[PDB]
Structures are given as structure tokens and as C-alpha cells.
Amino acid sequence: HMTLAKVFSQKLRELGISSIYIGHERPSLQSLAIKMLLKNYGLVEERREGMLITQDHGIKLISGKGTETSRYTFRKGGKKVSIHLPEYPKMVIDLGLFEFLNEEEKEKTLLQVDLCLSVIRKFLWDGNLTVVGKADYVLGRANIVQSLSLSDEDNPVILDPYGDVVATDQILRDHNVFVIGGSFPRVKIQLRGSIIGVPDEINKILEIILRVKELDQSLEEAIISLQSKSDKISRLLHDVQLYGMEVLEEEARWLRADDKVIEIVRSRLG
């Protein structure tokens, strides 16, 4: 779809603005826009000089002292830019069954939901995240609702590792609402025919989907980038039981698996 950084940059050019003095802020449009949306930060109209730090989506981000010309500086208290924030995608986490679980289980689930905020703010913004079915929960500007209300422009899918619809670049790309649990299609992410090795963690699933949608990355590469040592180990082990040792070496270069992983997988066999 569109990242917050991209929408921000298109509005900025329209007005006529292609340089910002950022002073002491992380020099990324995403970060700057998030900050503007969440704090009293904004743009102040002032003429300043600097050197380039970067050229994000075509906008010269300035600081320090040099010879690059800013007409606008990003400052605590400046004026907001007004940007049609992307309605989509909407990432929904369902906490319906939440009080089936153990105390220790609830603390793990919620820690995982907490980390979603950081993922959502890496591409979109808090508004694109919704949590359903727990009303005392508060996660920055996430929507916190008791039940999910569907609109005509919503085209949703349920992420379910026991689903009957295998996920695909196109299927993730052609949908815009995604429900991840604590009557639409129930969609299962596999690695290469299998669910084994696929990260289990709510915040990792969410990040896999966004990588595919916002960065134009493949599902395979997305999954692999987000695996833990344990995901790789468990998958190599499985596949060596299946296909034998000839598989090990090459399937480790593909899983991008490091020495420690391969060491361990050897050590389990002999």
C-alpha cells in the first residue's frame, strides 16, 4: 500500500516544501510524522541553513551548520501538516478468548500485542491497529473496541495456522483487513509447504504481512527474516527426519541459518 512516510512526502511537495531542518530528531519521514501525529511537534516556518543528513522520499533532511536551504524547521510546538492518513490496511487483533487463558499466558499474549505498536509505527501509524474484546487495554492510539464493525470497502481475511487457504503474495496484497487471534477466508502462512518454521508470535505475523504489503517483499523472504534460532532449528530438524542429511547444508543456506543453528541440528542427530 502506502507507508506513512510516502503520504507525508506527497503532501509536503504539494505545498512546495522539499527541505526540513530536523535538528536532533531521527532523520526518517516515518519517525517525524509519527511524532507530529502523537506529540505537539510540527513545522515552524523559519529560514535556516544546514547540511544534508538524507533525502527521504525526495525530501532533503537538514541539520547542523552548512549551505542547504530550509524554509521549514521541525520543532516542538510547530504547526501540524494535514495528511489523509491511509485507511488501510487495518490490522485487527482479537482478544475474545482472552479470559480462557492462564495468568502467565495473558501476560505473554499482551506482551506480544504490546510489540505490535512498534511494528505498526514502522510503516503505518497507531490508528491502523485495532484490538478487539478487552476494554481496559490501552496502546497509544490503537483502536480499542468491543466488537469489530465492517464497512463496504473492507475486504478481510482471518489469519489462521489451521486454515484451508494458503497465503500468497497476491492474496495478502489484494486484501486490506487482517484478523489475528490471541465468515471470510481462513488463511494459513506456510514456508515451503509447511507451517513448521513459521514464527508464531502475534507481532511477527503482523510484521510479515506488512513487509509483503508495504515493502513489496516476498512472503518467503519476510518469514525468513523474522525467524528465531528456534524456528530454523525446528524446521531443519523436521526436514532432516523427512529427507535426510544431504538436505541439511543447502537448506541452511536458504534458511540463512548460522553456525550455531547447524551445530545444534547436527548435535541432535549424532
Query: Could you list the residues that contact ligand SAH (CB under 6 A)?
Result: 159-162, 180-181, 188-189, 195, 198, 200, 202, 205
In angstroms, give the least distance from the CB of 56 to ligand SAH: 32
Show the CA angle centred on residue 28, arms to residues 25 and 31, nearest 5°.
70
In angstroms, give the least distance from the CB of 68 to ligand SAH: 46
Minimal CB distance residue for ligand SAH: 181
The x, y and z cell numbers of residue 155, run together, are 475486504
In angstroms, give the least distance from the CB of 94 to ligand SAH: 8
- CA–CA distances in Å: residue 222 to residues 128, 144, 145: 20, 28, 30
Handedness of CA 100, 102, 107, 113 (dihedral sign): negative
In angstroms, give the least distance from the CB of 205 to ligand SAH: 5
Spatial distance between the Cα atoms of 171 and 154, rounded to a whole number of angstroms = 14
- How long is the chain? 270
Spatial distance between the Cα atoms of 255 and 241, rounded to a whole number of angstroms = 17
- CA–CA distances in Å: residue 4 to residues 11, 29, 60: 11, 8, 17
In angstroms, give the least distance from the CB of 4 to ligand SAH: 24
Starting at the earlier edge strand, list the strands of the sheet with 143-145: 143-145, 129-132, 90-94, 177-181, 156-159, 186-188, 165-166
Nearer Cβ to ligand SAH, position 45 or 114?
A: 114
The x, y and z cell numbers of residue 260, run together, are 550455531
Identity (one letter) of the amino acid at 199? P
Nearer Cβ to ligand SAH, position 60 or 232?
A: 232
In angstroms, give the least distance from the CB of 183 to ligand SAH: 16
Nearer Cβ to ligand SAH, position 124 or 191?
A: 191
Nearer Cβ to ligand SAH, position 27 or 161?
A: 161
Nearer Cβ to ligand SAH, position 67 or 147?
A: 147
Nearer Cβ to ligand SAH, position 177 or 180?
A: 180
